[PDB]
mmCIF file of all heavy atoms in Angstrom:
data_model
loop_
_atom_site.group_PDB
_atom_site.id
_atom_site.type_symbol
_atom_site.label_atom_id
_atom_site.label_comp_id
_atom_site.label_asym_id
_atom_site.label_seq_id
_atom_site.Cartn_x
_atom_site.Cartn_y
_atom_site.Cartn_z
ATOM 1 N N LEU H 263 45.671 1.409 -2.427
ATOM 2 C CA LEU H 263 44.366 0.856 -2.500
ATOM 3 C C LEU H 263 44.115 -0.394 -1.489
ATOM 4 O O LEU H 263 42.919 -0.549 -1.007
ATOM 5 C CB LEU H 263 44.090 0.348 -3.907
ATOM 6 C CG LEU H 263 42.574 0.234 -4.325
ATOM 7 C CD1 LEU H 263 42.408 0.673 -5.731
ATOM 8 C CD2 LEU H 263 42.053 -1.115 -4.149
ATOM 9 N N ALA H 264 45.132 -1.151 -1.263
ATOM 10 C CA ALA H 264 45.039 -2.224 -0.268
ATOM 11 C C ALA H 264 44.894 -1.528 1.119
ATOM 12 O O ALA H 264 44.198 -2.056 2.010
ATOM 13 C CB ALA H 264 46.272 -3.007 -0.203
ATOM 14 N N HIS H 265 45.480 -0.353 1.333
ATOM 15 C CA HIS H 265 45.281 0.420 2.609
ATOM 16 C C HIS H 265 43.795 0.820 2.677
ATOM 17 O O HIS H 265 43.238 0.728 3.790
ATOM 18 C CB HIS H 265 46.227 1.575 2.633
ATOM 19 C CG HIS H 265 45.878 2.582 3.703
ATOM 20 N ND1 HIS H 265 45.990 2.387 5.019
ATOM 21 C CD2 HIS H 265 45.395 3.822 3.641
ATOM 22 C CE1 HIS H 265 45.627 3.359 5.749
ATOM 23 N NE2 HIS H 265 45.246 4.323 4.947
ATOM 24 N N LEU H 266 43.290 1.425 1.629
ATOM 25 C CA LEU H 266 41.869 1.792 1.580
ATOM 26 C C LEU H 266 40.938 0.635 1.715
ATOM 27 O O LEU H 266 39.931 0.777 2.491
ATOM 28 C CB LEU H 266 41.551 2.470 0.206
ATOM 29 C CG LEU H 266 41.382 3.976 0.270
ATOM 30 C CD1 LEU H 266 42.569 4.627 0.779
ATOM 31 C CD2 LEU H 266 40.973 4.447 -1.093
ATOM 32 N N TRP H 267 41.267 -0.481 1.209
ATOM 33 C CA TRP H 267 40.355 -1.716 1.287
ATOM 34 C C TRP H 267 40.381 -2.256 2.767
ATOM 35 O O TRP H 267 39.354 -2.722 3.163
ATOM 36 C CB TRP H 267 40.891 -2.727 0.253
ATOM 37 C CG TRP H 267 39.904 -3.947 0.153
ATOM 38 C CD1 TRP H 267 39.927 -5.046 0.817
ATOM 39 C CD2 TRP H 267 38.787 -3.955 -0.751
ATOM 40 N NE1 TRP H 267 38.947 -5.833 0.446
ATOM 41 C CE2 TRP H 267 38.169 -5.228 -0.537
ATOM 42 C CE3 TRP H 267 38.177 -3.069 -1.680
ATOM 43 C CZ2 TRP H 267 37.016 -5.628 -1.243
ATOM 44 C CZ3 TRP H 267 37.147 -3.542 -2.326
ATOM 45 C CH2 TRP H 267 36.541 -4.746 -2.205
ATOM 46 N N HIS H 268 41.558 -2.263 3.402
ATOM 47 C CA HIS H 268 41.587 -2.731 4.708
ATOM 48 C C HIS H 268 40.968 -1.812 5.689
ATOM 49 O O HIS H 268 40.900 -2.144 6.850
ATOM 50 C CB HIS H 268 43.046 -3.084 5.056
ATOM 51 C CG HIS H 268 43.614 -4.195 4.244
ATOM 52 N ND1 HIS H 268 42.800 -5.110 3.550
ATOM 53 C CD2 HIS H 268 44.851 -4.500 3.916
ATOM 54 C CE1 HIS H 268 43.558 -5.951 2.936
ATOM 55 N NE2 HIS H 268 44.799 -5.633 3.081
ATOM 56 N N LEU H 269 40.717 -0.554 5.351
ATOM 57 C CA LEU H 269 39.998 0.383 6.246
ATOM 58 C C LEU H 269 38.526 0.178 6.238
ATOM 59 O O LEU H 269 37.841 0.733 7.078
ATOM 60 C CB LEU H 269 40.310 1.814 5.880
ATOM 61 C CG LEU H 269 41.622 2.496 6.323
ATOM 62 C CD1 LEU H 269 41.707 3.916 6.035
ATOM 63 C CD2 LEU H 269 41.683 2.303 7.906
ATOM 64 N N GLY H 270 37.972 -0.680 5.334
ATOM 65 C CA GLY H 270 36.571 -1.020 5.259
ATOM 66 C C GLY H 270 35.692 -0.269 4.269
ATOM 67 O O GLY H 270 34.504 -0.439 4.274
ATOM 68 N N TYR H 271 36.411 0.567 3.522
ATOM 69 C CA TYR H 271 35.584 1.200 2.368
ATOM 70 C C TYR H 271 35.068 0.232 1.315
ATOM 71 O O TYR H 271 35.865 -0.663 0.980
ATOM 72 C CB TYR H 271 36.428 2.298 1.698
ATOM 73 C CG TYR H 271 36.871 3.411 2.671
ATOM 74 C CD1 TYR H 271 38.264 3.635 2.730
ATOM 75 C CD2 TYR H 271 35.976 4.167 3.316
ATOM 76 C CE1 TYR H 271 38.731 4.631 3.541
ATOM 77 C CE2 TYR H 271 36.541 5.170 4.137
ATOM 78 C CZ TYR H 271 37.909 5.346 4.249
ATOM 79 O OH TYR H 271 38.342 6.422 5.097
ATOM 80 N N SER H 272 33.786 0.365 1.001
ATOM 81 C CA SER H 272 33.204 -0.547 0.073
ATOM 82 C C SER H 272 33.695 -0.302 -1.391
ATOM 83 O O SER H 272 34.407 0.727 -1.559
ATOM 84 C CB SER H 272 31.619 -0.344 0.090
ATOM 85 O OG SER H 272 31.285 1.018 -0.279
ATOM 86 N N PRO H 273 33.551 -1.249 -2.247
ATOM 87 C CA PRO H 273 33.848 -0.900 -3.674
ATOM 88 C C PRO H 273 33.213 0.283 -4.261
ATOM 89 O O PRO H 273 33.742 1.013 -5.044
ATOM 90 C CB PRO H 273 33.536 -2.183 -4.423
ATOM 91 C CG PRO H 273 33.609 -3.318 -3.345
ATOM 92 C CD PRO H 273 33.196 -2.684 -2.087
ATOM 93 N N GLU H 274 31.894 0.438 -3.958
ATOM 94 C CA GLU H 274 31.034 1.421 -4.531
ATOM 95 C C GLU H 274 31.565 2.863 -4.356
ATOM 96 O O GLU H 274 31.802 3.694 -5.206
ATOM 97 C CB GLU H 274 29.606 1.267 -4.145
ATOM 98 C CG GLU H 274 29.106 -0.139 -4.198
ATOM 99 C CD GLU H 274 28.750 -0.678 -2.898
ATOM 100 O OE1 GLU H 274 28.976 0.132 -1.844
ATOM 101 O OE2 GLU H 274 28.291 -1.850 -2.713
ATOM 102 N N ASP H 275 31.782 3.249 -2.999
ATOM 103 C CA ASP H 275 32.242 4.602 -2.746
ATOM 104 C C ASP H 275 33.762 4.702 -3.104
ATOM 105 O O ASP H 275 34.088 5.882 -3.399
ATOM 106 C CB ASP H 275 31.987 4.983 -1.300
ATOM 107 C CG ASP H 275 32.300 3.930 -0.334
ATOM 108 O OD1 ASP H 275 32.967 2.906 -0.691
ATOM 109 O OD2 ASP H 275 31.790 3.936 0.910
ATOM 110 N N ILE H 276 34.503 3.587 -3.122
ATOM 111 C CA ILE H 276 35.805 3.751 -3.572
ATOM 112 C C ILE H 276 35.990 4.166 -5.090
ATOM 113 O O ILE H 276 36.544 5.120 -5.461
ATOM 114 C CB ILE H 276 36.678 2.453 -3.352
ATOM 115 C CG1 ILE H 276 37.101 2.520 -1.913
ATOM 116 C CG2 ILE H 276 37.835 2.309 -4.248
ATOM 117 C CD1 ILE H 276 37.957 1.240 -1.621
ATOM 118 N N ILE H 277 35.155 3.483 -5.852
ATOM 119 C CA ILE H 277 35.178 3.844 -7.267
ATOM 120 C C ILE H 277 34.497 5.219 -7.539
ATOM 121 O O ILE H 277 34.838 5.952 -8.396
ATOM 122 C CB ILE H 277 34.597 2.664 -8.168
ATOM 123 C CG1 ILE H 277 34.635 3.088 -9.667
ATOM 124 C CG2 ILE H 277 33.166 2.485 -7.856
ATOM 125 C CD1 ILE H 277 36.040 3.258 -10.244
ATOM 126 N N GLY H 278 33.449 5.498 -6.661
ATOM 127 C CA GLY H 278 32.884 6.880 -6.779
ATOM 128 C C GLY H 278 33.903 7.903 -6.466
ATOM 129 O O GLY H 278 33.919 8.962 -7.269
ATOM 130 N N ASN H 279 34.642 7.733 -5.400
ATOM 131 C CA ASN H 279 35.657 8.753 -5.062
ATOM 132 C C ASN H 279 36.750 8.793 -6.104
ATOM 133 O O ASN H 279 37.292 9.873 -6.364
ATOM 134 C CB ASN H 279 36.295 8.473 -3.673
ATOM 135 C CG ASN H 279 35.600 9.228 -2.584
ATOM 136 O OD1 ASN H 279 34.429 9.019 -2.159
ATOM 137 N ND2 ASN H 279 36.304 10.202 -2.045
ATOM 138 N N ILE H 280 37.218 7.689 -6.719
ATOM 139 C CA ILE H 280 38.227 7.645 -7.766
ATOM 140 C C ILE H 280 37.678 8.531 -8.923
ATOM 141 O O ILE H 280 38.317 9.330 -9.518
ATOM 142 C CB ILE H 280 38.567 6.173 -8.148
ATOM 143 C CG1 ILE H 280 39.358 5.596 -6.951
ATOM 144 C CG2 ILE H 280 39.280 6.167 -9.412
ATOM 145 C CD1 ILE H 280 39.877 4.175 -7.422
ATOM 146 N N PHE H 281 36.453 8.265 -9.331
ATOM 147 C CA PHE H 281 35.891 9.090 -10.429
ATOM 148 C C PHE H 281 35.804 10.593 -10.061
ATOM 149 O O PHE H 281 36.059 11.405 -10.927
ATOM 150 C CB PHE H 281 34.353 8.534 -10.786
ATOM 151 C CG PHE H 281 33.626 9.453 -11.668
ATOM 152 C CD1 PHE H 281 34.134 9.776 -12.896
ATOM 153 C CD2 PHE H 281 32.528 9.964 -11.225
ATOM 154 C CE1 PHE H 281 33.432 10.595 -13.715
ATOM 155 C CE2 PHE H 281 31.776 10.914 -11.961
ATOM 156 C CZ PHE H 281 32.199 11.195 -13.276
ATOM 157 N N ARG H 282 35.377 10.895 -8.767
ATOM 158 C CA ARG H 282 35.218 12.307 -8.469
ATOM 159 C C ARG H 282 36.575 13.005 -8.431
ATOM 160 O O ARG H 282 36.624 14.213 -8.832
ATOM 161 C CB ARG H 282 34.479 12.396 -7.104
ATOM 162 C CG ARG H 282 33.026 11.940 -7.236
ATOM 163 C CD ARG H 282 32.184 12.678 -6.136
ATOM 164 N NE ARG H 282 32.493 12.292 -4.826
ATOM 165 C CZ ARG H 282 31.724 11.529 -4.083
ATOM 166 N NH1 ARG H 282 30.452 11.139 -4.565
ATOM 167 N NH2 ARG H 282 32.027 11.225 -2.774
ATOM 168 N N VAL H 283 37.625 12.358 -7.895
ATOM 169 C CA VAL H 283 38.891 12.935 -7.870
ATOM 170 C C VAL H 283 39.481 13.067 -9.413
ATOM 171 O O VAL H 283 40.053 14.080 -9.816
ATOM 172 C CB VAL H 283 39.856 12.167 -7.024
ATOM 173 C CG1 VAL H 283 41.259 12.680 -7.100
ATOM 174 C CG2 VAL H 283 39.371 12.475 -5.557
#
Side-chain angles (χ1 to χ4, degrees):
Chain H
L263 202 149
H265 168 69
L266 251 61
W267 190 268
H268 295 340
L269 276 185
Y271 299 122
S272 58
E274 312 115 357
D275 43 16
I276 278 182
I277 180 64
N279 265 70
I280 290 187
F281 166 63
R282 292 209 291 250
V283 172

